[PDB]
Ligand SMILES: N[C@@H](Cc1c[nH]c[nH+]1)C(=O)O
C-alpha cells in the first residue's frame with residue numbers, strides 16, 4: 073500500500089552516485105579553504121528557526137515540519153542550515169577558536185510545501201559558513217567557493233548574481249519607501265502582493281503577474297541598491313574588487329530578495345538556465361546579528377548553500393553522465409544442491425577484497441551463465457561434482473569465454489591479477 | 493540561548509571521523525557481498541512503522557517522533573530501517589530484479605525517549621537487508637556480514653548470540669504458555685510487564701527491573717527455543733551448520749527476544765561487554781511477512797543493523813584511536829594590511845590542488861609562524877612589502893626551517909614536489 077511520501081524519494085543507482093560525486097567535490101574545494109565538517113542534528117528547538125529565519129518569512133510561517141516532543145518542547149525539522157550552524161558555533165564556544173571559523177556540511181533539509189508535486193519536501197544541500205569576521209574578503213571567498221564547487225563539477229553555463237541588502241536599517245527604510253509609494257495604489261496590486269505589502273513589502277518586487285510588474289514600472293519604483301547605507305556600499309565595492317581580481321564573471325542585481333530574513337549586506341546566487349523556473353543552483357550572503365537573535369554575542373558571518381538535486385539537473389542538462397553499475401567480479405553458479413553452500417563458503421573466502429556473489433539454488437550451466445551475464449559479472453564460476461571433489465573451481469571470463477580450472481587457493485590471485 | 497536538543501549532538505572532529513571510518517568499512521564488506529546502497533527518506537507514512545514494527549511494541553506505542561503533514565497525512569521520523577527498506581522494495585518493483593536483492597544504507601534513526609540523558613534520540617546505524625528468499629544461507633551470511641563489519645574495524649572482543657523465534661504458530665503457542673504461567677502471578681509483575689502480558693507477552697522476558705527477572709527465575713519459565721516447531725528447528729540448524737563451517741564463534745541463546753514484532757525464525761545480536769548496559773553493538777534476524785503487513789506479496793528477508801555510536805564506544809574501549817588531522821599545506825601570513833587580500837588571492841590560485849590558508853590581519857613574522865605551527869601547516873608563507881613588490885613569496889618549511897624566496901609562479905610546483 074504505502075509509497076514514499078510525495079516530495080521525498082529513495083536514493084539509489086546513478087542518481088545516488090551523482091549526489092555523492094557532488095558532495096565529494098564540494099568537500100574537496102571547501103576543505104582546501106580550511107572548512108571543517110560539522111553535521112548538526114536533523115531537528116532543533118523550533119525557536120532556532122523562528123528567531124533565526126525571521127518570524128515574517130514563508131518558511132517559518134507555513135513551511136516547517138514542526139512537532140511536539142512527548143511531554144513538552146517544540147522541535148522542528150531543519151529547513152535550512154545557517155541558523156543551526158550558528159547555534160552550534162555558539163554552543164561549542166567556537167568564538168574562542170582562531171577566527172574566522174569555516175564550517176561545512178552536506179545533508180537533508182525539510183520544507184513542508186503544498187502537495188501537488190511542487191518540488192521537494194526533503195532535499196539535500198551543501199552548506200558553507202564563515203563565522204567571526206566582517207571582512208569583505210570572506211564574502212568574496214564565499215562567492216568564489218560556491219562558484220568553484222559547480223565549476224569543478226564540469227558546469228560551464230553558470231550565471232553569478234551579486235547584490236546587497238544593506239543592513240537591517242537600510243532594509244527597513246526601503247520597506248517604508250515601498251509602502252509609501254505603493255499603499256495609495258494598493259488597489260492595483262495582486263491579492264498576493266497586497267498581503268506582502270504588510271510584512272516585508274520587498275517581495276512585491278520579485279512577484280509574478282502583469283498587474284504588479286506594469287504598476288512598478290509606471291510608478292518608477294527605485295532599486296534597493298539606491299537605499300544602501302554608505303558603509304554598506306563600501307563593503308559591497310570591496311567584494312566586487314575581489315571578485316573582479318579573481319576574474320569571477322558576475323552581474324550586479326538591482327536587488328536580490330532571498331527567502332530568509334537574517335541577511336544583511338552581501339547577497340548572491342548562481343543560476344543555470346537549463347532547469348526552467350528554480351534556475352537557482354544555490355546562493356547565500358552575509359548575516360551578522362543572527363547569533364544575537366539566538367541569544368548570543370555579535371558574530372558576523374557569510375556563507376552559501378546549494379541544492380544537490382538542482383546541481384544534478386544542471387549536470388544532466390550539460391550532458392554529464394555516469395558510467396554503468398559495476399557487476400560482481402565473480403558469480404558462482406552451483407551445479408548440485410551440495411554446491412550451493414560451498415559456493416557461499418568460497419564467496420566468503422574471496423570477500424571483501426573481491427566482490428563475489430552466487431546462486432542460491434542449483435542450475436544448468438547455460439542458465440547460470442545467463443544470470444552471471446544478467447548481473448554484469450566479470451567471471452562466472454562453476455561448482456559441480458567434479459570441482460567439489462577435486463577442490464577446484466571452473467572460472468570463465470564472460471567477455472572472451474576463456475575458461476580455466478584451478479584450485480580454490482589460486483582463485484583469489486588469478487581473479488585479482490586478471491582484473492586489477 | 494538554544495542548545496542541541498538532548499539526545500542529539502553536532503558531529504565534528506575525531507568523533508565524526510570515526511563514524512566515517514565505520515561506515516566506510518561497512519560499505520566495503522557489504523558491497524563485496526553484492527549489497528546495493530539505497531537511502532530511504534527521513535520520514536515515512538506513520539503506517540509503515542505502525543504495521544511494520546507491530547502496534548504492540550514500545551517503539552510504535554511511545555517512542556516515535558510522529559507529526560502531521562501540512563495538510564493531513566501522518567508522517568513519522570524513521571525509528572528503524574527494515575520496514576522502510578521493504579517499503580522501497582515493494583514500491584520499486586524490486587521483486588522483478590534477480591533475487592535475492594541485497595540493500596544497505598547508513599543514516600540517522602530517531603527515537604522519542606524520555607529526557608534524562610537516556611543515551612540518544614537521534615543515532616546512526618548501518619543497515620543491511622537481503623530480500624526475496626527463505627534460504628538459511630542468507631541468515632548465516634547476514635550474521636557473518638555483521639560480524640565481519642566489526643571484525644574489520646579491528647574489534648576482537650565480540651560476543652555473537654544466535655537464536656530463533658520460530659514461526660507465527662510457534663510464536664503464538666509460546667505467548668499462550670507465558671500467559672498461563674504468568675497470569676496467576678500477574679500481581680508480581682512490573683506495571684510495564686502487566687501491559688505486555690496482554691499483547692506479545694514475550695517482551696516481559698526482555699524487560700528490566702528486578703521485579704520481573706527474579707519471578708521469571710523462580711517460575712522456571714522455559715526458553716522460546718523449546719517451543720520451536722519442526723521446520724523452524726530445521727532452518728535454525730542449517731544456519732548453525734553454516735556458521736560453524738565459517739568458524740564464526742557464537743552462543744545459542746535460550747530466548748533472544750528482539751525489539752520488533754516483524755521477526756520470524758532467526759534472531760541474532762553481537763555484544764561487547766565494555767560499554768556498560770546496552771552492550772548490543774547490533775543485531776538482526778529474519779522477517780518474512782513484513783511485506784504483507786505493508787500490503788505487499790510475500791517477500792522473505794533477513795538483515796541486521798548496528799549502532800555507529802555503540803561501535804565507536806567499542807572501538808574506543810579496545811584502544812582504537814584516531815590520528816592527527818592534517819593541517820594546511822601552506823599558511824600565508826600577511827605582514828602589511830595590503831598583503832591580507834593578496835594572501836587570499838594567492839591562496840585561491842593554489843586551491844584546490846593545494847590546501848592553502850591565510851591570516852585575515854597583518855602580524856609579526858614570529859606570531860604568524862606560531863599560528864602556522866598551531867594549524868599544523870607544512871609550509872609558512874610570508875607576504876610583506878618586499879615580496880609584494882617583487883611578485884614573490886617567502887616560503888618556510890616548518891619542519892626543516894628551510895626558507896625559500898620564489899616567484900608566485902614557482903610556488904605551486906615547489907610545494908607539490910616538496911609534499912607529493
Ligand atoms: N541557508 C541558506 C543559504 C546560506 C548559507 N549561508 C548563508 N546563507 C539557504 O537555505 O539558501
Ligand SMILES: N[C@@H](Cc1c[nH]c[nH+]1)C(=O)O
Nearest residue numbers: 572574776777795796797
Ligand atoms: N530493523 C532492525 C535491524 C534489522 C535488519 N533486518 C532485520 N532486522 C533494528 O532496528 O535493529
